[PDB]
Amino acid sequence: SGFRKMAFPSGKVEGCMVQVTCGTTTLNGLWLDDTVYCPRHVICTAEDMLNPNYEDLLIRKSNHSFLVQAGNVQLRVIGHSMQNCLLRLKVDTSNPKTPKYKFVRIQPGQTFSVLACYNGSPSGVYQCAMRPNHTIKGSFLNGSCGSVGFNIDYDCVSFCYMHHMELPTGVHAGTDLEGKFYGPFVDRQTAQAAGTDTTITLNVLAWLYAAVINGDRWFLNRFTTTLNDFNLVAMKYNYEPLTQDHVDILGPLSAQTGIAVLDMCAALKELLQNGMNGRTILGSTILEDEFTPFDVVRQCSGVTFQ
Numbered sequence: 524s525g526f527r528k529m530a531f532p533s534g535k536v537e538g539c540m541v542q543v544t545c546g547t548t549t550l551n552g553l554w555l556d557d558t559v560y561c562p563r564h565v566i567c568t569a570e571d572m573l574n575p576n577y578e579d580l581l582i583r584k585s586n587h588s589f590l591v592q593a594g595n596v597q598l599r600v601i602g603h604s605m606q607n608c609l610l611r612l613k614v615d616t617s618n619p620k621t622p623k624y625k626f627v628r629i630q631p632g633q634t635f636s637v638l639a640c641y642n643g644s645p646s647g648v649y650q651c652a653m654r655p656n657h658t659i660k661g662s663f664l665n666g667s668c669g670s671v672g673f674n675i676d677y678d679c680v681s682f683c684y685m686h687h688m689e690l691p692t693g694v695h696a697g698t699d700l701e702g703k704f705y706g707p708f709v710d711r712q713t714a715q716a717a718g719t720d721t722t723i724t725l726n727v728l729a730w731l732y733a734a735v736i737n738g739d740r741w742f743l744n745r746f747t748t749t750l751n752d753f754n755l756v757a758m759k760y761n762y763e764p765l766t767q768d769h770v771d772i773l774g775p776l777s778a779q780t781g782i783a784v785l786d787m788c789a790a791l792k793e794l795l796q797n798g799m800n801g802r803t804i805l806g807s808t809i810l811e812d813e814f815t816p817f818d819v820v821r822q823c824s825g826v827t828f829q
């Protein structure tokens with residue numbers, strides 16, 4: 524039946540995107556109820572970017588220093604505050620499209636959908652994972668600040684990311700919806716670089732289970748392994764150490780395929796040591812680590828091929 528890196532339908536989120544301008548800077552904002560959220564760096568000027576003092580720069584502005592536009596309608600800002608690295612703009616109107624939602628701080632290794640926006644207008648949607656080094660490999664251009672990352676459960680949108688900047692390696696950094704950065708990054712244009720990253724072991728294992736659920740067992744073997752013996756091989760290939768908690772999480776998938784977690788680890792250990800041998804898994808020539816065990820169960824069918 525196939526396996527794709529699919530994102531959540533973006534509708535509920537599109538109806539919350541607005542444009543926010545201050546000075547000569549324009550970026551996207553998130554409009555929920557009667558509040559608009561956006562990167563606080565929107566109040567910076569070319570010279571302020573290197574070493575800005577936001578509390579100082581902010582006190583120097585008023586409600587009308589901010590221009591908030593929803594579609595082709597201007598929104599009147601009647602208050603403002605700073606929450607960590609975000610600005611909280613109160614508007615005279617409550618967003619009619621506000622969906623049931625909540626703010627969540629995603630954890631490393633987890634995935635979410637990003638709705639790339641420009642000038643308050645949604646341009647695209649794609650899935651990505653929060654890297655262990657706290658960055659994401661997105662696709663953002665100037666003007667994308669304010670674009671958000673999210674997950675959806677039933678009809679509740681869990682916002683978990685707002686975009687703020689790009690690092691030298693072409694990767695991206697941002698904050699949760701409370702304005703707290705993911706990683707040791709700060710909103711200042713002083714030299715910063717992503718730390719060394721690692722492969723998300725739990726996800727690679729989840730992805731292998733998905734492959735089995737979809738029909739092939741070519742990579743499996745007759746061996747098994749000690750959690751400890753696996754981790755020695757993990758360090759060598761720069762994979763995150765596997766823990767008992769990770770083993771526990773893979774429980775349901777293990778049950779649906781009848782393949783013991785440690786046996787799959789043995790299978791992975793072999794793939795890392797011998798390679799793909801010119802063969803593919805779910806269409807890939809490399810081991811994918813951007814699918815959580817949750818993403819697999821969500822997408823795949825509850826019945827394995829066999």
Ligand SMILES: *[C@@H](O)[C@H](C[C@@H]1CCNC1=O)NC(=O)[C@H](CC1CCCCC1)NC(=O)[C@@H](NC(=O)OCc1ccccc1)[C@@H](C)OC(C)(C)C
Pocket residue numbers: 550564567571572573663664665666667668669686687688689690691695709710711712713714715716
């Ligand atoms: C959202 O509009 C943007 C998005 C960037 C632009 C290109 N792709 C993106 O995702 N906002 C920015 O342009 C930010 C804005 C500043 C953030 C801090 C507070 C003041 C405004 N800048 C970046 O995202 C720049 N990143 C960065 O400076 O990082 C620290 C640093 C400084 C010097 C050397 C290494 C690292 C980007 C434009 O610059 C580089 C591509 C050189 C990293």
